[PDB]
Design a binder for this molecule. Sequence first.
Ligand SMILES: CN1C(=O)CCc2cc(Br)ccc21
Length: 209
Amino acid sequence: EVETFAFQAEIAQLMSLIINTFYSNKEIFLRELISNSSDALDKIRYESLTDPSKLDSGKELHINLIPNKQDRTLTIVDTGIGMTKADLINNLGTIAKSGTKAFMEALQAGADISMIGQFGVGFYSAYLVAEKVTVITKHNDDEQYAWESSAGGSFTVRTDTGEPMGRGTKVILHLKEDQTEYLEERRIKEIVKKHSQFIGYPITLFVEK
Ligand SMILES: CN1C(=O)CCc2cc(Br)ccc21
């Protein structure tokens, strides 16, 4: 049972701008997704200080980067707080509406796309390199969900039947044909070292067989 939703007009406009603007410095997408993962990990860590049972779904707090050349995907996995169905359909888009407006105003004033994370909408930088994004997520208070969008104004949400995750979020970037450099070990290592060297959680870059 797949539900299809329309993006708000302003968010659809932001994704079209990201997909269509000429902008060579695409590698910042990885910093933005790792930053998101680190915030989600901060949130479950802090909540667990006053309710230890929130880690019954997994004590390890980490981030894994998994490239797969056969599927042409880069997966960013974290064991953070995860996202509820209401987050996926309502709450994140409500926050993202005001952040997008602020970001668009900044861009017209002279800013560049690399500053997107200062406006809370860094997730959408995934579409610098991905033709489709799939998000699998599990919050302690809800079921496991799959969110998916190839832009074009709509996204889907369904209950996910795959491998149970325990808790956290998996972002699967289905890369554009000319962006396969982000599947190479040496390239991912360079980007993490350059932009994410002080993240307070272990980042494991998986290697391919
Ligand atoms: C803003 N947004 C969405 O609307 C749904 C999927 C998602 C995942 C992560 Br992780 C961060 C933000 C989003």
